[PDB]
Amino acid sequence: MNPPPPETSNPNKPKRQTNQLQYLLRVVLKTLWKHQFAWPFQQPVDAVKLNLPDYYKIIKTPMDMGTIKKRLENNYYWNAQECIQDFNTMFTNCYIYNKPGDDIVLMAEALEKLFLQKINELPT
Numbered sequence: 001m002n003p004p005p006p007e008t009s010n011p012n013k014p015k016r017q018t019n020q021l022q023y024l025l026r027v028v029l030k031t032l033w034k035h036q037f038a039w040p041f042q043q044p045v046d047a048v049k050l051n052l053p054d055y056y057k058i059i060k061t062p063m064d065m066g067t068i069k070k071r072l073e074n075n076y077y078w079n080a081q082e083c084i085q086d087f088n089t090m091f092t093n094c095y096i097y098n099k100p101g102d103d104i105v106l107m108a109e110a111l112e113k114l115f116l117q118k119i120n121e122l123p124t
Ligand SMILES: O=[N+]([O-])c1ccc(O)c2ncccc12
Pocket: 039, 040, 041, 044, 045, 046, 050, 052, 093, 094, 095, 097, 098, 104
């Protein structure tokens, strides 16, 4: 059984649009999305389909770029640091569940390095 996916809207949560959050969607996310290694991270981990019934026994704060993208489109975040923390949760979950050198980890590491390149300079 997969858990419910993380929320992409929350009426009790204050919304905001900043230049930096616009940039995270238009430039950072949408460029990472097109990377050849992006596909495992474009939706919540489907532990059933992948026959990983221990995934959500280990990973208790799941995150994926599909959730992040919908959050950005919904202005779910208050600032860019909130969105960047979601990215870092997604990368860290992959390194927690997997082992150095695994094909999936090499993919995550490729994206994380590109992610770090892209957020080195945010608009003002
Ligand atoms: O294919 N996947 O979606 C996937 C995503 C993230 C992960 O940490 C995975 N680990 C093992 C197998 C598939 C994984």
